[PDB]
Assembly symmetry: D2
Homo-oligomer: 398 residues x 4
């Protein structure tokens, strides 16, 4: 009826603001937020030391209806609009807890399985995934090839109705907890272009020859279980194949737009969270007989940060609106992923600076936020690549 | 029904794009775009030498219905909506012709008169204005005080029911071709703050005392007749007072947001032009066998500008929509003005650079768009002031 | 004895600072400064309206001992060291007067002739240039390419002992007042790579077929006469050929390091100028009960500008001490050229901002400085080419 | 002889380059680089798990002459000029091992003692600190005040010739290992400003009431034992007081230039390391049938980076030379600490990107460099306070 946009809101993270949301979305958001305050934030520090979140926190997120929110109810998901899905990405961001990998799981893997899987595959996976009993992961990057997809060597050869898979992936989110992993492999070692020789497989924990590697020591996402996967002559039945044979690259191209929107929103949300935290810190930090928020350099530094966050938010919210109507193209999503991910980092740099030396301490949220932010301009295709795609329609007009 | 957003358009300027416009608005845009291509661009380079546009080009746009577009029809205006008006700003910016002080005429002066004037004042001014016969300008800035209000000394003292006006003003747009000018003067040197002692006055070309000063020699807007004004003992009738006495600042407060949104739209629009003008140019510029557009670096710089231009566009239309609903608070207005004008300049700079040496010759459109862009971060309040304002809500909880 | 660096200096433009200079140089500098305040500044106002400067001031300069300074005395030059010629580039930059093409004339045109020329060409023109009678220039860029390295199409085919020249040039400094103009042509188009099919010819005002296009209308450098040059069939004796035939490129190469170190020192010197001009303005511009120089944001903006101008100056000074020792490679010089020139612009953008409206008036020195800085990033080889050149040793191992 | 400057050396880290060094300096540099490769690098990953290095590495360092390098030989140190002390800083920075607090020990603590101590204090400490058997630390910062000195609560009430020290410190380098701590306390509460009521005190491990707090958990400098200290009614003998009573501020001010120059060189050396580390990585990273270094963009990002590193190195070397001559003032020193440190982070960010996703893995050096670099723009005084000091000489006449 009379909803406010972020610039005008009391706090960038307030509830019931931004035009793309309805009052039902508001009610949902308040509960998702309660959920993070109570079931996630409290245990996060321990998962960090642990290297991954608990299955128990997944099992609950599912019983609560936070997993597979944009997945069709008649397909096994909870069945909400896109806006309801983003509320989950955003609220997780706002809790500044990066351990839970619900997004990779809910917004990516599940979409691949429902948008391109057999009636059987969907029936078998989707339900467990929504309940959080079956955690999802997707592995496409390899030691050698990450930006040059046309050069990844993981392969799958037919041996009757079966597919024998060999290879290894790296940097796989949820890699440790993963029960089902959508593996990207070369099936046609002789297609004209490697973009017509890739297939997708639903590999599972339990298959002989599926070896999960050591959990990666990173500078951020301390609670995210990023790991390596190895495949040693894994015999996959016919049903392991996700979608049509050799159509692998095609299914991907169609899902990337959403994988990037997801990142873009997460990053700008992260930015909003950092901004209210820091604004807070400097308004309570005594200095020179008053607070640091009284300093003009600080006042303008905060003005520049808020402006860039609201301006960008506007564009991401604009993108969410489009993807809901299924009119979000590759280039567009790319612009959101890239800018939002670069800003997230520039915001963090300045927000750690305003905390002074406490911003370097792990006990303060902003420290986590800073190293957590550096991954965003990298995965989902680096920003360099984002520009390649964006420039396509610019210089090589159809 | 269904429209594309700037990112996916074939050109950031095509008509029919942007979700905030109707099929009708496009017809009007097609026509205004037309007006500028024939009635303006051809003669602009000539007006540049003259230091001002012709009163003829003004009148044409008058009858053409390009003035007072957002001014209510029953008040002497063409009675359109905010968007229709925005179109006008945008098309002129797209023409790369900064001479016509059209925007300040329709968007600021006329709005001041209708929103705050009285019956005679409205029936005596608007028509001549909507007609393009009685040009307008607004003067506030002074030699010693722009960003400061306790710094202006232009004043008016009562003598019965008349007002004797004295002082000067500088940097006035349409200063030379103006017929009516809204002067800001002090009328109560006793008010605690100058915000309680300022009034608005409608001075008309021809009044004894009113003097048109030197046409300032600027670095850009070589066709805008930016001048200086003098008021030597002018006896103004009680009819000149616009609004209550000592309420002037309160009105200026209400109108600034529209001044800032305009400049913002004009700013980003100006960027949208430079992009295509530069995209196209480097696509056709032969070098090393192919064109310069085949250089990856040129491809990325190009992606960078488009992303920034598109992300800001989204925000500016966000602000047009809010203002159409008369729900655009000052802070948001300021963010628009500040970030858009700023972007405009780092875009104008890169675009020149991609135009190599020729981006330095006045023959090419970009060159002038560069020196024209530099004035945006300064008027309507310097970007520094914008930040002061946007920081108010961040730090001072009222 | 003791000497401070720019940071410690009272003003950045103080005489008697920077390790590389001696009292010897200091006396000559005060000597040169005087020349610019008394013989250049006074008339610049006018030359900007004539597009070109007076032929007289050039004779005054030369007679005075400014033209031909790094030019050895045994060949008709003042013979001073590099620091001496540097002092001339700098002082002019400090004068904010860009009309005089003194630097291209005695820093480039005179080196070429005396570095690869016959004892005839030397005796014949050097002395007349040093005197300020024969104004020199050089042309290599054409409307088709400035960076192609072969985009040059102006050819020079032999006909006995006298060469027949043919082609055209663009963006030529000292274009109109040019008595002599070195030209780069294709003497052996059959060459493996055109870096071997180029030669140099000393075109002289008067030769039949040597036409001079009119004054180019530029955005900045107003009193700098830049025009196009044509060659419609001129018979040139066996003397016009400078150095060897087809071994011409080797020359352009061996002198480029110096053209670029020149622009560098200029850029940073103009930057040292703008800083002090702007610091002066702020310290006296009243605002909010005290000077704008009392605002913390300004104080900080000023510190960023000083630090960069100081960090860089040091580098340019380092590049000077190296060049004085004939050991400044292409790469090092390019760096100084790339960074100095860019910095000059950012410094210019911020300096204008601190002047407010007034920074956009041709009245104020900073205004012309702004547009006169936009050319450095472009000429002497664009900053992009500077990057190509620096990248080589980085990536492609020698 | 013919020493080269960084822009022309094979590797910015090659020994034998940069003009401020001598053949004996290079001989020393090989010795130290070697020590870091043998005694430090190999054990660092374990010290990282521990949160502090071993005392063994210290006693080693001491024995091999790396501690107290620029301290007077007759005073207990090992004698030697600044350039030699700079090399120990730089080399450590080149080993990318921030664990050992050798610099804060030799570059700061020892200097405070040998510059203002007593013949008794000097004799009792330097010897043991040179042997690395007595590790020192500096403690000024307190939880509620790090920039505002007017707010440090640690105090010492005089009692006879005794001092009763109470209070606490936080963010203290070598805090855990610390054998001697230079604590800054308020000795005169009713003083005119707080800059006249501060004394320095030599607090030693073993003093009753000197409790070492816990090691702080940071985002970087994982092997640096940063802790918080407490002073509980410690009765310091009169020999505990360093220098004149209440003149503590004066000693600090005198030393600050060296502390900021040190942080600065450490920064630019880390950048030199990172650049070379990344250049190397892209040359060996195969992508698209070629390397990452074949892409034009990577080439320019590399040229840009190298240019800023070579330029900031030029300015930093100049500071060392100035400091060797004892003519390095506050401002110049802040200038280097502020810019070098910000650049270090900019450089670290782009080097992580160029490493793709591997730059986020702790296994890779560039990852340590990233978090390890974020601390420099903060300690030694924040970069904002740096600007404050630089901005002093600009706006307020001496
Ligand atoms: C913690 C973490 C989580 C991640 N999660 C997943 C996941 O779950 N599943 C998965 O498969 N991957 C994931 N990744 C990997 C990530 O998607 C890849 O790192 C990224 O897509 C490509 O980087 P790369 O590692 O392949 O490095 P490369 O691709 O070898 O190098 C990339 C860099 O090289 C340069 N570059 C590359 N191509 C170009 C170009 N064409 N033009 C200009 N420059 C170019 C730029 O520096 C670019 O950033 C994750 C990574 C991390 C670190
Ligand atoms: C081409 C052109 C057309 C214009 N048209 C009009 C017009 O038609 N009518 C009209 O009246 N005016 C107009 N102006 C004037 C313009 O609005 C003023 O320049 C502007 O409002 C204030 O700038 P100033 O020149 O007064 O600078 P000042 O106010 O003297 O100084 C401004 C600068 O000081 C510093 N500054 C000032 N205050 C702060 C602060 N609070 N915090 C941090 N920094 C601060 C910043 O450097 C800021 O940029 C125009 C100006 C130009 C150049
Ligand atoms: C006022 C003025 C004075 C000048 N004086 C002289 C003079 O005295 N004599 C003379 O001969 N010239 C002079 N010039 C011309 C100047 O040297 C050229 O403009 C400059 O070398 C750029 O070449 P260009 O103008 O042909 O632009 P182009 O080379 O056509 O375009 C340059 C742009 O294209 C892209 N680009 C080009 N090459 C590359 C690349 N290799 N890699 C990545 N990007 C690239 C970048 O955007 C680059 O900025 C002057 C120019 C001006 C305006
Ligand atoms: C790991 C590490 C090691 C360190 N080692 C030492 C050590 O050995 N000994 C020691 O005592 N300290 C050390 N420190 C502490 C460091 O020196 C201080 O944190 C720093 O000097 C001030 O930080 P603060 O948090 O107290 O600043 P705060 O006052 O909490 O906040 C500072 C920030 O507020 C703003 N601000 C503050 N003042 C102004 C101003 N006046 N004008 C404009 N903006 C301002 C800026 O954001 C400034 O950066 C170290 C810190 C860390 C993290």
């Amino acid at each position: 009826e009379e909803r406010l946009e972020t610039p005008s809101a009391k706090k960038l993270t307030d509830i019931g603001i931004r035009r793309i949301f309805s009052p039902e979305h508001d009610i949902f958001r308040k509960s998702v937020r309660k959920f993070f305050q109570e079931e996630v934030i409290p245990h996060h520090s321990e998962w960090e030391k642990a290297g991954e979140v608990s299955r128990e926190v997944w099992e609950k997120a599912g019983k609560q209806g936070l997993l597979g929110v944009n997945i069709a109810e008649h397909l096994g998901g909870i069945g909400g609009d896109l806006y309801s899905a983003a509320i989950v990405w955003e609220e997780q961001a706002y809790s500044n807890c990066s351990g839970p990998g619900f997004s990779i799981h809910s917004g990516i893997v599940m979409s691949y399985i429902t948008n391109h899987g057999s009636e059987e595959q969907i029936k078998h996976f989707i339900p467990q995934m929504t309940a959080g009993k079956c955690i999802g992961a997707i592995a496409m990057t390899e030691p050698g090839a990450g930006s040059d997809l046309q050069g990844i060597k993981t392969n799958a050869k037919k041996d009757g109705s079966d597919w024998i898979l060999n290879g290894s992936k790296v940097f796989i989110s949820n890699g440790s907890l993963s029960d089902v992993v959508i593996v990207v492999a070369v099936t046609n070692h002789e297609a004209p272009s490697p973009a017509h020789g890739i297939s997708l497989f639903l590999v599972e924990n339990g298959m002989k020859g599926f070896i999960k590697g050591r959990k990666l020591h990173k500078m951020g996402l301390k609670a995210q279980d990023t790991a390596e996967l190895f495949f040693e002559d894994i015999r996959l039945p016919a049903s392991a194949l996700l979608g049509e044979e050799n159509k692998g690259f095609y299914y991907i191209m169609k899902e990337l737009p959403q994988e990037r929107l997801l990142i873009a929103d997460v990053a700008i949300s992260a930015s909003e969270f950092m901004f209210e935290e820091t604004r807070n810190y400097v308004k309570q930090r005594k200095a020179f007989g008053k607070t640091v928020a009284h300093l003009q350099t600080v006042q303008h530094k905060l003005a520049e940060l808020k402006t860039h966050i609201c301006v960008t938010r506007a564009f991401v919210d604009n993108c969410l609106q489009l993807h809901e109507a299924k009119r979000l193209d590759s280039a567009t999503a790319c612009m959101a992923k890239y800018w939002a991910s670069e800003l997230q980092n520039s915001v963090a740099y300045d927000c750690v600076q305003l905390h002074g030396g406490w911003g370097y301490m792990w006990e303060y949220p902003i420290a986590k936020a800073y190293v957590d932010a550096r991954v965003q301009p990298i995965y989902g295709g680096t920003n360099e690549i984002m520009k390649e795609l964006i420039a396509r329609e610019i210089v090589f007009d159809k």
